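User: Sequence for rhomboid protease glpg below. Tokens please.
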Amino acid sequence: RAGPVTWVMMIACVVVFIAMQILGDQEVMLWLAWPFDPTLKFEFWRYFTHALMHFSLMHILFNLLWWWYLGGAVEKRLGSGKLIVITLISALLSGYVQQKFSGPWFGGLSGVVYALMGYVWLRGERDPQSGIYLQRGLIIFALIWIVAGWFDLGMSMANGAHIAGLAVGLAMAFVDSL
Ligand SMILES: *C(=O)C[C@@H](NC(=O)OCC(C)C)c1ccccc1
Ligand SMILES: [Cl-]
Ligand SMILES: [Cl-]
Ligand SMILES: [Cl-]
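Assistant: Structure tokens for rhomboid protease glpg:
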């Protein structure tokens, strides 16, 4: 079964998605979005909590599916701490890049998922003996979803923020395979 970080993230995303149905998207964004006013710059959960919001069924379904599989594998073979750090860093950097180019109204686990995909892929590529790797079939489906995002075949975050997410995963896999 999915480990505690994999699980709690899934739940938290579900709980937040429910809140968005009941209260509407904007009202939840009011509490969880990246600081959108200087008077909010010190509400520190906001530098992370944007990752918890999703805006359509597809968004959350595909995000949580990749999270469950990639995040769950990383947690199981490499431990909870590893997943936590990949998540915190990719969420911060992809959120940063996203707000820089398009403002603070966005959300979702996509940055985090790009990181995990980059992490699992490069890790297996550079260091089979780790046990971690991204199957050929999954590389293909990952590539297809990356293309969908690149050429807009409607998503919260832009290409840049997804790249920022990927860079974190590649960076960490690179570090680890030394
Ligand atoms: C974030 O990138 C939103 C995408 N997520 C997607 O499925 O990417 C998966 C790749 C493995 C990175 C999305 C998907 C469906 C609907 C909306 C947004
Ligand atoms: Cl499970
Ligand atoms: Cl997105
Ligand atoms: Cl390791």
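Residues 1-178 form a domain with the Rhomboid-like fold fold (CATH 1.20.1540.10).
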